[PDB]
Amino acid sequence: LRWQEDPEPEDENLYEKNPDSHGYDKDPAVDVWNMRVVFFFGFSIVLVLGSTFVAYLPDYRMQEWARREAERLVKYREAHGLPLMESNCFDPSKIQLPED
Amino acid sequence: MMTGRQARAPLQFLPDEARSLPPPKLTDPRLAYIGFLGYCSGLIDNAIRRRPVLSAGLHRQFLYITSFVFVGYYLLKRQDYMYAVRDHDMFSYIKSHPEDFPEKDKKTYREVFEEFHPVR
Amino acid sequence: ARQWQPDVEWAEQYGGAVMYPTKETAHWKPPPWNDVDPPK
Amino acid sequence: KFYIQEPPHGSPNWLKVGLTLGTSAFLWIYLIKQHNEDVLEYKRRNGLE
Amino acid sequence: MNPIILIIILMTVMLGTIIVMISTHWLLIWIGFEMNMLAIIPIMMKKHNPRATEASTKYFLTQSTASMLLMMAIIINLMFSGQWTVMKLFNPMASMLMTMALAMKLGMAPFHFWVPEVTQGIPLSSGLILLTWQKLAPMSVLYQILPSINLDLILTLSILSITIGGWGGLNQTQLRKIMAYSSIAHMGWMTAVLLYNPTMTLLNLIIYIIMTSTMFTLFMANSTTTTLSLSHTWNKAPIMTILVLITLLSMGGLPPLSGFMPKWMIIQEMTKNDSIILPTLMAITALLNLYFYMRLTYSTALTMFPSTNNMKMKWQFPTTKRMTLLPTMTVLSTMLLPLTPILSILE
Amino acid sequence: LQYGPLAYILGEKTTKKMTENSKLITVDGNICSGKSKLAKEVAEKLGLKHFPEAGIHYADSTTGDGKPLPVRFSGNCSLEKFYDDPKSNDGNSYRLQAWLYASRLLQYADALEHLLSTGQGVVLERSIYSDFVFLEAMYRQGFIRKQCVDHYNQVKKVTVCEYLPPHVVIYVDVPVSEVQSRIQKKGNPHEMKITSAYLQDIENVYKGTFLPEMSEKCEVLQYSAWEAEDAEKVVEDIQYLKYDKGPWLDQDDRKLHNLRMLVQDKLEVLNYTSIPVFLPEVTIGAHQSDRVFQEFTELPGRKYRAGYNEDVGDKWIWLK
Amino acid sequence: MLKYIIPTMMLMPLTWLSKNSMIWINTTLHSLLISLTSLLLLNQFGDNSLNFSLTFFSDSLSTPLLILTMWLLPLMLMASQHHLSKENLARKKLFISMLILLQLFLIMTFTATELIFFYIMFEATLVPTLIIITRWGNQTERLNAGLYFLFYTLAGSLPLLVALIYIQNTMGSLNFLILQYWVQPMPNSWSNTFMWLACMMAFMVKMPLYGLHLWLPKAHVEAPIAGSMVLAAILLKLGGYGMMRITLLLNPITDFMAYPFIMLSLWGMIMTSSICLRQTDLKSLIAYSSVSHMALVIVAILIQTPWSYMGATALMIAHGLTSSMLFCLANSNYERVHSRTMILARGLQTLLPLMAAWWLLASLTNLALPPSINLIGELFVVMSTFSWSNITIILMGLNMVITALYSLYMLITTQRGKHTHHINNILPSFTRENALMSLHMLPLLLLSLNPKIILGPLY
Ligand SMILES: CCCCCCCCCCCCCCCCCC(=O)OC[C@H](COP(=O)([O-])OC[C@H](O)COP(=O)([O-])OC[C@H](COC(=O)CCCCCCCCCCCCCCCCC)OC(=O)CCCCCCCCCCCCCCCCC)OC(=O)CCCCCCCCCCCCCCCCC
Ligand SMILES: CCCCCCCCCCCCCCCCCC(=O)OC[C@H](COP(=O)([O-])OCC[N+](C)(C)C)OC(=O)CCCCCCCCCCCCCCCCC
Ligand SMILES: CCCCCCCCCCCCCCCCCC(=O)OC[C@H](COP(=O)([O-])OCC[N+](C)(C)C)OC(=O)CCCCCCCCCCCCCCCCC
Ligand SMILES: CCCCCCCCCCCCCCCCCC(=O)OC[C@H](COP(=O)(O)OCCN)OC(=O)CCCCCCCCCCCCCCCCC
Ligand SMILES: Nc1ncnc2c1ncn2[C@@H]1O[C@H](COP(=O)(O)O)[C@@H](O)[C@H]1O
16 A cells, blocks of 8 residues: 555535535635625626726827818818828938938 | 956955945835844744744844845945946046047937848 | 646655666666665 | 643743843944934934934 | 854855955965865764765865865966966966866866765765855856856856756756756856856856755755655645745746846856857756756645555644744745846845 | 773673563563553562653653653653544654664663663563564554554664664454453543554554564463463563573673663764654654754753753752 | 735735735735736826836836736735635735736836846746745646746747846936937957847746747646636736837847747747647647737737737737636636646536526637637737738738637537536636636726727837
């Protein structure tokens, strides 16, 4: 009988000693309060108020602003005969090219 | 590196010119971390002798914290002194050798040509 | 169903004089426990 | 009385407790005195008063 | 041993190391090494068994041969310089002989053949003295002669020490031989950064002495000399398994621990000097040291090897041992990396 | 702590109190030799301190409240189940013998600690030098294996070499039939299952192996059953001994200081009883050891060091 | 970022000063509060990252990884409190402390402004993960799993340390904010080739790359459930985050050096997905699916177009949630049948119908069902790789066949068919388990309503 050993215990069922178990703890009061903690600070606080927070982000990464500013600039350069965008990002007068 | 600096004044932990520097505050976060090391030493000391770790030997934990803060204050003073010496010798060597450190003329990006490498 | 913890077959791998026994390191018995040898 | 033998740590070693608290109080007052002397010497050598 | 004689002999070991550290004359360096060896021989023979006599004989022969080569380097320096000052050496032959002598005294490879033998033969306390305090006087003399040390020689000794001390500990189940090959690899790390920045040499020496003193104090506090007896520590004092876990993961060079502090700084000083291949090979070769450290953590902390019945008696008795500075050294060997710029005090 | 090298330096030499009353006396004999009062009778004539024979719960009697712990915490063995089923499958025989050897090693350490600290001699019953006779009787009766004898010999080889023999060994000749008569008059129903051949093997390893090797390193005093009833004759024979053999004569202050520094540290005494020799009689597996260790921690007075337990009434813990 | 590091640190007294029955409740409650507080990192701008200090910053790449990291901790505490119910109280607090310390290392791995602090936290995440796998794992092979996990990682990353210190000595700073403005083009040389390999192979190991992936099906199946959730959900994404930081410096050499590492990915996601067609172990099937999904992120980082980065970060967040849910479902069966064999327990929709609905939703998000962010990331990677080479759609589309053929096979083998007759310990689903599945799936579905917060610094 090699390496004296406790026998491997049986698989314990939380529903036998507690048919109203939520699966959190073998103590039923601790089980119900862990359920309330998980559901309140998980769903009522992070998910609901978090979805409300992300839904009302103050113009996340300026993507509304960038539209509205564009609605100004097109309106500036439609009326003044300018093209809507130049092929050059910078002024070609302020660039020294390497000579050739 | 700086071994020839501390050779005219040997075995001085803090020299006289180290008093021309601001000392570390007692609320220095490095010093607060060394005090936290003292508290962790007190906790390990109560743990290995199988005392209650938080409750037993508050005088002993307090002397651990006090001893680490006391040693670490002078260690931070010597640290700040040696870095101030490093910077002082750096700046004096740059000043006394202008021909080795020429004043660079920073060209703007309208003259600087960079090769464009397209990601396609 | 529970956690595996090492048995005698696993733990006797660490009991020899060396860790990887070769042909040369095969007659090496492990040293005595108090490191004291018989006087021969 | 619980223990069948008097343990080495049954009573606190009041000499050692007194040495511990005296050493710790001395190191704190010497540290604060050293720091006040250091900030006063810094403010004297740099005129930052 | 009579404790007055033990005090006098340990103060004489310390006196030999101090005479090496403080003296400006080569003859006094040699006298300090002779005094150090002469006094440390009865620390090795504290127990009077054949393994301590064998370890002391091998240690005497290696250190005497090293001191002969040291005095020959001193006399060749006397010829080619007419003086005795402890500074750079004025001849590459004397430089080679003194570098060989100090490499033998450190047990750096290929002169490493005594450190697992002598470390296994002697007790854990004298093994601690050997692997920590005897690595202070040759590192003093190496710190003092670095304008004359051959680069190729000290780098060959260093990387050969790191490789051989890496491969040596993989085949070990005895804790003292593990700490001895760990010593060989760490002295290779210290001497590889010697000519680039010797402040990092002193940093690695101090962090190594802290971690090695922690590990030997844990071994003495648990009374374990083999791997398989260290594996019973979870059933007796389970905090000691946590301490050997954090200290062995620290000695492997893993962040965020303080044993990552020297290694990284050594790499930080060898890439400045345009050496990229050599600290890379050193870092990759340190994974072998990490592997047998991880083997010890598997056997001790992360699993539970089967214990015996008589351990139930040792549950009823606490440790009355002087675990001197063990929480201090355990905190300093694990949680010192956020204080990494403290190394400037070693300048 | 209380004793160390500094106490030895500052004048506490341990031969300044070594008087002629400082005699370590071990009374031996068979299972019901009637020595059990005899030793105490010697301890009430010579003014010595009697230690009872180390059972399973001797370590329980020295630590904590002194009460015997439950047998799953101390021993994991039973003498009565050894008397019932000696050839048992669970290996109770050698497990009981190894626990008793560790208990007698602890008792012999307590005896030398009292002898070297106070100068009062100790009267023991069946010290570690006589513990092997039960091992050899169990091996001759086939109760254990040869690997159990090899494990015992390794543990004994690395533990008994650091100690001294007793000054006096008293042995009591009681024949096997008289032992069985005293067992039948004892009334213990487990002890009456002891076979005759086991008692004969105990007497044979006594008279053939124990006493011829102990007669050189100490002084044997071998009595019969009727003359061991009179303690005055035995103590009169003790008081007129000429102590000349054994290694107690060449013991200075240094050797007895080293012995006392070994002896007062109980985890260094018990260091080699738990050597990693994986033997199925004494190896307790990982989950059982973890479970019994965590149940041992939850005992009253066992969760911390011996002056740090609020559940038994230790005060001033924050200043200790 | 010091308003997130200090609450995570204060979870250490919160788990070590609690009552012996309240340590799961307290850590779950306060880690859910930290996860609610993690939404303040959404103060992102279309030009500038949210730059807190010299030490910590958070762009739109690190912010979803941080919200997922701080959200994963209560979920790991919920998953891990069943199989650690018989555990010693001290070892239970040690496990919770390793999860807390791992969260603490991750949330300042992703916010590290300077790249060697990124390296130190990036390689500090090994030790709590190593201790969790090799201590609270179940089988014999957890020790070999820890060895492979440790020594592929450090073999990949010890060249990365040397490469970062080279950048520190050459450029002058490993600040990512300085290196956006001082980045120099890395030319064609052998020195710069092994510079590229030292910068990339650490993250190629931790993604994992195909061929270097062998640490992962050992480290996922031998870990406990909190370990499996943190390796699936976060610890693979350290490689993607580090690649997206470090490929700034590796231009234009990447445009000819990424060719062997794209092929290994584009064929490797075919191979590992094919492996999932024949895996007898359910947890190994989820592991090889994780390799198959992170191969697309490797391709998307190495082709370094904007659509590819947007798809890669969406795919990382989506795969984190989905694979964490898949390991939790496999754990829900393993806590009843005590074996990870996928053919053992069958027909489990007759026995656990709502849990089979959670299996169905997790399998649909595995097979990239639109409009989930799984499909958003999958689709954008496929778009950018069609821009890379038009033939890649073959290797993409075939993968999207096989990714269906194990997502539903896992659904049909575990949940459908006739149930196993001789298994009768199939308990009804606990409220803890259904809560865990819902806390994985409901954020994954709500992120379809607003995917712009998980599309990286270049939305
Ligand atoms: C910000 C405010 C937002 C408010 C709106 C919400 C937005 C979406 C949030 C999540 C919605 C789905 C959640 C329910 C499914 C999971 C639970 C479950 O098992 O349900 C069965 C159960 C009813 O079954 P039973 O008879 O009682 O027993 C269960 C059976 O034994 C066994 O069950 P079974 O076999 O009978 O059922 C299996 C069956 C299986 O049916 C299917 O799988 C077929 C449906 C999916 C494929 C076909 C459609 C593909 C997408 C097209 C539709 C969307 C776009 C349409 C827009 C126009 C075109 C672009 O499941 C369903 O029919 C579920 C319907 C919803 C499926 C959504 C898609 C999931 C598929 C995977 C990803 C696909 C892409 C992402 C889609 C994202 C949409 C936003 O449902 C419930 O008890 C519901 C409980 C409360 C759920 C609350 C959901 C929201 C929570 C968020 C909290 C924080 C924010 C506050 C808002 C709260 C709103 C009230
Ligand atoms: C983020 C990275 C980590 C991932 C894990 C995160 C875990 C932590 C969780 C924190 C909380 C959750 C975070 C994500 C929140 C996402 C939700 C959100 O903010 O949405 C914003 C979006 C915002 O929409 P919007 O951006 O267009 O609105 C404009 C903005 N405002 C409001 C300021 C004007 O919300 C909605 O779209 C809500 C619309 C109404 C509600 C839903 C309606 C549809 C319901 C079904 C209708 C019928 C369809 C067919 C059905 C058939 C059957 C199936
Ligand atoms: C995960 C398993 C596989 C791991 C693969 C890891 C990446 C593979 C390549 C790593 C190379 C080593 C680090 C290189 C750092 C480059 C820094 C730099 O700028 O270098 C320029 C320098 C160039 O020198 P320099 O830049 O100082 O010179 C001055 C400038 N010039 C050139 C103009 C004069 O490169 C080198 O010095 C050498 C680079 C190559 C190194 C060869 C040795 C290592 C070989 C590969 C080892 C791979 C891991 C082995 C472990 C496997 C598992 C056990
Ligand atoms: C660059 C130059 C730097 C120079 C720095 C000098 C700093 C001080 C010297 C450090 C060098 C190593 C010191 C340790 C040497 C070994 C001491 C030793 O062996 O002491 C014997 C004793 C044995 O313990 P015991 O159980 O009673 O023994 C049973 C019978 N033998 O006890 C032990 O074995 C226990 C261990 C006691 C000593 C350990 C603590 C000191 C060293 C650790 C670092 C402390 C932090 C401050 C200094 C940092 C630098 C090292
Ligand atoms: N090593 C041992 N093995 C088995 N039984 C022992 C051992 N030592 C003592 N005993 C028993 O302890 C009892 C001592 O008898 P007594 O003389 O009444 O103390 C008898 O039952 C012995 O069999």
